[PDB]
Design a protein around this ligand. Sequence first.
Ligand code: ZN
Ligand code: ZN
Ligand code: ZN
Length: 178
Amino acid sequence: NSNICEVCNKWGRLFCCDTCPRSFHEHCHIPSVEANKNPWSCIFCRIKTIQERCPESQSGHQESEVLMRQMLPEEQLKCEFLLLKVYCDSKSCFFASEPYYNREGSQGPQKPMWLNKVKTSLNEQMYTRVEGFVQDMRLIFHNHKEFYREDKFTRLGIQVQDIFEKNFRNIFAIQETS
Ligand SMILES: [Zn+2]
Ligand SMILES: [Zn+2]
Ligand SMILES: [Zn+2]
């Protein structure tokens, strides 16, 4: 197994996957690494299993159909994995915890949103459709772009949104387009 967390790239108290060489901090894995379970399989491995069981699941889909899906166990897992892929980028730090807004010439968003809030909402089964999760994720970056206006720091929202969107297309097998 790797000697660093797959998500934050630090050593520490690491749990090792039994079916692949990845390792995790307890609360870096999503869901949080399970108490017992021998053997244990990481989220990467669980996602690969879904694909292998249903190879047609990789055929292209329309985004509108994906968003309307109910959050049954496989869609729950896919959203947890997508969230974890965002935390894998170091730039997620800017979006992880609760923000506050006090900048001359800007007003804070009407509906603040952050990654740890989406993480809690997934854990608490607060989303009934994929659309709820995706809307809160896109709201993070939209709030950031609107608040930071012409400051170059706006770019951090474009960067981490691009990681979200590429992973969304991959994980939910969105039909490739020009
Ligand atoms: Zn970690
Ligand atoms: Zn694994
Ligand atoms: Zn099948």
